[PDB]
Amino acid sequence: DIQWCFSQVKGAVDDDVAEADIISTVEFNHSGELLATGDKGGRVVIFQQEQENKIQSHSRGEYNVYSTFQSHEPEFDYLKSLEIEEKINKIRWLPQKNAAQFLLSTNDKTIKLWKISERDKRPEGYNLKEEDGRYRDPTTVTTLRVPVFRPMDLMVEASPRRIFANAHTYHINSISINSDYETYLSADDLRINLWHLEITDRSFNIVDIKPANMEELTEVITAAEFHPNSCNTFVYSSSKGTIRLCDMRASALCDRHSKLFEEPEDPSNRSFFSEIISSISDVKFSHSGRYMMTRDYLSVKIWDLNMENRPVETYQVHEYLRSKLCSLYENDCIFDKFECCWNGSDSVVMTGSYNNFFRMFDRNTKRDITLEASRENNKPRTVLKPRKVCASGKRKKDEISVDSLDFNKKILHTAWHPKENIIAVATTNNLYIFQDKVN
Amino acid sequence: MDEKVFTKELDQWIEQLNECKQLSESQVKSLCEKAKEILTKESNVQEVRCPVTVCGDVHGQFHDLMELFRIGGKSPDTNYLFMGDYVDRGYYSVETVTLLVALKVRYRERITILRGNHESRQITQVYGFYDECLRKYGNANVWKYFTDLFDYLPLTALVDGQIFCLHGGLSPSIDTLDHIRALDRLQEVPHEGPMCDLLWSDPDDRGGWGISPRGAGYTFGQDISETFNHANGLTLVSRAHQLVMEGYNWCHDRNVVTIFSAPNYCYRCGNQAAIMELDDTLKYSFLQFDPAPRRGEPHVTRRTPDYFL
């Protein structure tokens, strides 16, 4: 089994961050070089990897800042006129087209499309003025020379290239580039659109479950996705447990699904809360193409594309809180949109938890660890020690009591390097880069 | 001399505005000065003679105004009598208000535009008019011009002394138009006072007196409205500034009528709209209509588009 070793930290160093300092999404690139991080207020930041200087091999470079640009400004939608917000919900990286590195970005109601490019040349000289800006006489011009390009330092930029604004009634919460570098989708809480990357004035509604009378809301969409190898298989989740899997081949309007993954609820658990603790939160596919994790509130579950009524595996994240559920409901912590992330090769899973814990179960050996992110007890190139939670009073110098966990430092968003083992857990205000212990 | 070139300039301005194209600040300044010097003559109460086609809220929906012009006859062939509210969430509010004021300036007899409650500097600043001016003109001079122009607009209007028209409701401190002639209009409408009730009050189906949820004005009941109607020797009162599903709605024993002229308000309520046609025999009618099909909007079309074939 692998070992995890604290290897970097970023962002603020204190514990008194403002509102626009809460890291709200983290999404690696396709290769692994860049790493976006769009904290609240719109301040998307981008960390480049220090490329491997062949003099030092083992020390895979630490992360350095590469650019920075405001994404979304506050707004007022006079039609409804309340509080159009400046959060950042979902960053996604388009593949490599040219020396640029495009990336989508979305507040609650408008999806931009940025671009990160490099400039290292400038013109030097004129024909009406000198470099000072002091104009010469418009008659003193006798010969003509053309401005030439002379080298300069390196510089970056981030220009909003398109804006897919004003199409969703409710709040956008998911994006997924499709499979063919041409389209993508974006699912609000009751609709689903399907844009085209180079057309900013149209869309194609493709799923609608809005009841005519808005009294009976039973299900709401909570996450969508495509297939990383199929052109026509999007797998939008729901809010009652089901995970429909439409198919854009049979009929255009995919309101008629082609499967329905659904757990046959067991009367041994439903007491007062199953209908609220059995809501899917982020349905991710797997780099292979077959499995599809769905982190609900209390249990990671690995489904399969060939077994409707039952998961293949199952895991428990913080099952010791099924009693605390009541108290957790008293401060709205029972509602918390968590998230997971696969391995680079389908072998390990992970998911955030409470009090800065982030387990990582194992596919083959069924083992599960429980680390803890904290600046104080570690230093670069140290080694992390698997913690241990305890439900009862058996507190012997190696555990943390259930009645001592602080349900205020929630590690929601995480990531995982698409090839190697460099994960990036994003706490409430920092961007830990636990690197592996390469040997 | 100057009159002929001014009329030709106004004709060119109207023709250009008819295809949704704005103007320059010098043109706006000249038109605002001319509108000032024209409207300074008309008193608060204005007696416009029949025939006329009463209108309602437009709230900056330019395409709805064009549909109205296509429904109830193009100006200046048919008279018109608006009731304010050229702001608050229209997509082309500046175009609508400049078209209306240009028509008023060129045809100072055919058309008459009343004063709305929503055309006050703070109100337009809050409800997007200031934002529209900033994003289209690049400054706030035109907004100031329009706001100072708004003071000269008449409070109410009269038709043969029987049909009374106003933007909102009546006031408890006001009993007849003789106080209206005494009231000054060259000041900002406050959140309190008889003018605020004139512009913000509403009639209610329930009895008694209630406070409007908008934080200003007090809702007069059936009794006060009826007493005013039989005291002033009128037949009915025509008001606006209330969204109703069926376009027009009679109220308070057919004494006060509610008229809306912006179909599909805010593009979501999906209501209807109507305009009270008034003839020479004073036989009031209604002409319900639906919002015109538009183009350029981001279409969430269930039908497949041309990029996905």
């Binding site: 409710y170 809301l217 559920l325 009541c326 409901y329 | -």
Partner: peptide, 22 residues
């Protein structure tokens, strides 16, 4: 067992309910 006597979950997705106009 639990004592928050209720049988609804329209709380988290509240704005999805009416909040209709004005």
């Amino acid at each position: 067992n639990d004592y928050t006597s209720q049988m609804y979950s329209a709380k988290p997705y509240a704005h999805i309910l009416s909040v209709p106009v004005s």
